[PDB]
Amino acid sequence: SFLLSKVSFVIKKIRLEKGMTQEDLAYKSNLDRTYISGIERNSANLTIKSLELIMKGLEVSDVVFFEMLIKEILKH
Amino acid sequence: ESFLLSKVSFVIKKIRLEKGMTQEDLAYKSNLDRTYISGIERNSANLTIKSLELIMKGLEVSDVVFFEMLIKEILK
To answer: Which stretches make up the HTH cro/C1-type domain (chain A) (predicted)?
Structure first.
């Protein structure tokens, strides 16, 4: 899936840009490290509530996240 | 429901009504249950990214269009 891969990519990109490991983001959001690893491989079951929490943890606003996402969708 | 949650629900229903589609129409076109559509439009907490992909495919709305509308609603 095109959208799933781009969501996964943007979450990994923002996490790596904040210098956070998957563990770091998990600890900040009270999620497991394997949930973050999992979403970066396949974002199918990531919910909007979990994405809001992740965006909170990455200290990215929702608008910037979606701007980043539109950019990735359009690059393709 | 947070404001991101509410706005995702709002934008789905906004586009659905602009498309002249009922909930049942969206359910048919997305291959999701009408109960689930009903629920998302009230509260998007448990909407997954795959279900959002199928909702956009059933509304026949470009993903970029959906996220641009979402950014505009978040900013209002």
So the answer is: 11-66
Task: Please indicate whether, in this complex, the C-beta atoms of B50 and A44 are within 8 angstroms of each other.
Answer: yes
Structurally, chain B folds into a number of domains equal to 1
Return d(Cα B72, Cα B66) in angstroms, integer.
10
| Full residue range of the structural domain in which residue A35 is found | 1-76
A44 touches chain B (CB under 8 A): yes
One-letter amino acid identity for B44? Answer: S
What's the reported resolution, in angstroms, to a tenth? 1.5
Q: In Å, how far is B72's CA from the nearest CA of chain A?
A: 9
CATH number of the CATH domain containing A65: 1.10.260.40
Q: For residue B67, give the chain A residue with the closest CA.
A: A66
